[PDB]
Amino acid sequence: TTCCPSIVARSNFNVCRLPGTPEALCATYTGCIIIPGATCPGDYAN
């Protein structure tokens, strides 16, 4: 599951993913994170 720290960070993550870029590279590029669970914490609410 991906969790993003702000709305802008999530919009940038979605554009990063359009050509197929792996999630791990889009995560360090945007500040979003990847967790094994399904429940994002409150400071990664977007």
Contacts 24+ apart (CB under 8 A), 7-12: 7/46, 9/46, 10/46
Final resolution, Å = 1.1
- Integer Cα distance of 3 and 1 in angstroms: 7
The DSSP secondary-structure symbol of 44 reads: S
Task: Write out the residue range of the structural domain in which residue 18 sits.
Answer: 1-46
Phi, psi of 3 (to 5 degrees): -130, 130
CATH number of the domain to which 31 belongs:
3.30.1350.10
- Integer Cα distance of 15 and 41 in angstroms: 23
- Integer Cα distance of 23 and 14 in angstroms: 10
Cβ neighbours around 30 below 10 Å, total: 22
Q: How many domains does the chain have?
A: 1
Of residues 18, 23, 17, 20, the one with CA closest to residue 35: 23
For residue 39, the Cα-to-chain-centroid distance in whole angstroms is: 13
Elucidation technique: neutron
